[PDB]
Amino acid sequence: MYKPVSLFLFFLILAAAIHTNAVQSADEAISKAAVLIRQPWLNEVMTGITHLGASSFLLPLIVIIGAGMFFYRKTWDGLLMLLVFGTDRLLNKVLKEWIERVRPDFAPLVHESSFSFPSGHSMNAACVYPVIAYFLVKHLPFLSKHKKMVYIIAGVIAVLVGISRVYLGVHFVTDVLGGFSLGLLLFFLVKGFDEKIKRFR
Ligand SMILES: CCCCCCCC/C=C\CCCCCCCC(=O)OC[C@H](O)CO
Ligand SMILES: CCCCCCCC/C=C\CCCCCCCC(=O)OC[C@H](O)CO
Ligand SMILES: CCCCCCCC/C=C\CCCCCCCC(=O)OC[C@H](O)CO
Ligand SMILES: CCCCCCCC/C=C\CCCCCCCC(=O)OC[C@H](O)CO
């Protein structure tokens, strides 16, 4: 359907475009321009923000939220959340090792030990936070009438995580957009599935 196909097509176009010198040059220019806004206090804040996208943070977060939902509503939907997360990490790893993009390496503020495209923190955040939002709104009746705000929070968090990877000099903008599009794709897939299997609307 429209939204996951558009994101998939957007990723393919980006995966091709990063091989053009025009995009590589714009990616370099934006990466270096981000250094100009840096301050040490903001370096610290952005490092804290970026941890919200770390798989070492999101795995215990998903397990905690899923456990909470199990006690509160007896749902096993936390297993769906773990599955889409694992799918997300597997897909990011396979694409990274296939594409083998070199990292910016102008001015990194955090450590990395892998290829650059697509960004795993951005892919993690664009998948997990909208997914969490979906299942929280599904299972927490006190979040009804706050649904738009829950999803806005998930979107703000994911965007900030992506911004932080460019700020911290470890991803190019296109790495972030590539990870955004595929994490969001996985979100729409698991949301569409969960809604499709409902026996009452
Ligand atoms: C959701 C839309 C429908 C489905 C998705 C298909 C269309 C995606 C839209 C724009 C892709 C832009 C990609 C961003 C990278 C820019 C690519 C580019 O402009 O390349 C210029 C070329 O390199 C000069 O030599
Ligand atoms: C127009 C809307 C539909 C778009 C559908 C297709 C658009 C993207 C094309 C192929 C995707 C696969 C990308 C694979 C990467 C190709 C570039 C590449 O591999 O370059 C390597 C070569 O060694 C250079 O040195
Ligand atoms: C009603 C029950 C369902 C809702 C669930 C209620 C709680 C969910 C809300 C906040 C969780 C905050 C948890 C903070 C995340 C901890 C992640 C962690 O442990 O971090 C590991 C560290 O990063 C290693 O590198
Ligand atoms: C109607 C749509 C049909 C789709 C319906 C399901 C919704 C999609 C969600 C998850 C896919 C499940 C695939 C499970 C693959 C798990 C892979 C895994 O856990 O690997 C961990 C990772 O490799 C550590 O590095």
Residue numbers in the entry: 1 to 201
Show the paper's wording.
Responding to this critical need, we introduce here a fully automated method for collecting, selecting, and merging data from hundreds to thousands of in meso-grown microcrystals. This approach boosts the collective phasing signal of many tiny crystals to a level where de novo phasing of highly challenging membrane protein targets becomes not only possible but also fast and high-throughput. We refer to it as the in meso in situ serial crystallography—experimental phasing (IMISX-EP) method. IMISX-EP has three components: (1) in meso crystallization (and in situ soaking where appropriate), (2) fast, automated grid scanning, and serial data collection in situ, and (3) real-time data processing and selection of data sets followed by structure solution.
IMISX-EP using heavy atom co-crystallization was demonstrated with BacA and PgpB. PgpB was pre-incubated with Na2WO4 and subsequently crystallized in the cubic mesophase. The crystal used for data collection was relatively large and measured 10 × 50 × 150 μm3. As the crystal had its flat face oriented approximately parallel to the windows of the well, it was possible to record 140° of data using a rotation angle of ± 70° from this one crystal without compromising data quality at high-tilt angles. Because of the strong anomalous signal from tungsten and the high diffraction resolution, the structure was solved with the relatively low redundancy of 2.6 and a completeness of 91% with SHELXD/E. This example shows that the IMISX-EP approach can be used with large single crystals. The strength of the phasing signal, as estimated by the Bijvoet ratio, ranges from 1% in the case of native-SAD PepTSt to 7% for tungsten phasing of PgpB. Therefore, experimental phasing becomes considerably more difficult in going from working with the high-resolution data available for heavy atom-labeled W-PgpB to the mid-resolution data available for native S-PepTSt.
